[PDB]
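The following block was generated as part of the benchmark described in Methods. Ligand: zinc ion.
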Amino acid sequence: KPHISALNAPQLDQRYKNEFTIGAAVEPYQLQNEKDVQMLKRHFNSIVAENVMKPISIQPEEGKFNFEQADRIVKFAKANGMDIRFHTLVWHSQVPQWFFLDKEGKPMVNETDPVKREQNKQLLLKRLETHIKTIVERYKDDIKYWDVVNEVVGDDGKLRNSPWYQIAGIDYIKVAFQAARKYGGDNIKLYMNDYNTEVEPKRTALYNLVKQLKEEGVPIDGIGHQSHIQIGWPSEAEIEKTINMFAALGLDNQITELDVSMYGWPPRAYPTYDAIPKQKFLDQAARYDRLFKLYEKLSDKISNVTFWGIADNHTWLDSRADVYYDANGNVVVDPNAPYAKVEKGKGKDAPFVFGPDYKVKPAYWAIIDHK
Ligand SMILES: O[C@@H]1[C@@H](O)[C@H](O[C@@H]2CO[C@@H](O[C@@H]3CO[C@@H](O)[C@H](O)[C@H]3O)[C@H](O)[C@H]2O)OC[C@H]1O
Ligand SMILES: O[C@@H]1[C@@H](O)[C@H](O[C@@H]2CO[C@@H](O)[C@H](O)[C@H]2O)OC[C@H]1O
Ligand SMILES: [Cl-]
Ligand SMILES: [Cl-]
Ligand SMILES: [Zn+2]
Ligand SMILES: [Zn+2]
Ligand SMILES: [Zn+2]
Ligand SMILES: [Zn+2]
Ligand SMILES: [Zn+2]
Ligand SMILES: [Zn+2]
């Protein structure tokens, strides 16, 4: 199948229009690039902000709200008939430090006095409610899907002990969903988003957390599976079990940040796109073929599949693409091979079905067909 321009190619969202929406994460400057705009209009019917809707982007200082960048994404979505996902109301990264400072300016996590810790908990929860209220009151009529909390379960199977949890305990999760439903109403859909949702003990810990929260009447509508995955892991059988188990609790499932890395973990990356062997793209295409056949099998349980980017010229995985060099200066991509030094974050990954020149890859043909 030819490496044709993705602007002359069959629309990816139309191939999946009865199964689930097809989305992309974007930055506002991509809306000023003719190729990226052309790609969003041609192939996607859902959009999400890669970064400008995170807590530190929206309220960098208490009371100073920047909706300008977020507004540009929302206006583009509306003009183009796209669904919008909000990422994300609560997270322990890209979150402003002012949330966690007491009235005298000291970090609340340092407080030992029980009465003062309880006062700090209430102050943090009030600030959390106001952040959520201001955002949902502005976008409740435009944005259907919301990542209310992101990454609240740890990889060890315990709740993540971030400042949110250290200061307020489980109530910050409850307050966040409660607040989004209160100001957004019943028509917005609320999600708990996380990575490695297919991996134990995290998977069981998330399951138990959401089961309990719903038993308590906390309003959660679905689970976002970030799906930052590799060519061989996690297995499709494990992805299927995961999606099925959350659907059995009555939860919608969205694949929210899909990218299929060319590497393992920790990744040993090629230094440029040019150096990635052709065989890697065929291995990736076979993975995409099996993944999307599985998503179609489970389409009644998945409302959206969103890629964490548009095309291979821009992906956050490049920040993880470390390049290892041997004593002679040769690149090393075998995890067990000798190496002398590493250049962190300087290599290139190639995770999508669209190449860096906006031409389709073998993975695109693998998912646009009906085999
Ligand atoms: O310097 C800052 C950068 O580090 C920052 O990079 C962004 C980090 O978040 C990325 O998105 C996350 C990927 O991991 C998932 O688990 C999360 O849910 C996603 O939000 C994003 O792709 C990177 O651009 O960018 C902002 C700089 O200030
Ligand atoms: O900050 C988070 C990263 O730590 C996370 O990376 C994962 C770490 O565990 C590995 O098994 C996974 O391969 C890798 O993706 O990604 C999400 C990000 O928010
Ligand atoms: Cl990025
Ligand atoms: Cl190419
Ligand atoms: Zn379309
Ligand atoms: Zn090139
Ligand atoms: Zn569906
Ligand atoms: Zn980016
Ligand atoms: Zn090319
Ligand atoms: Zn196929």
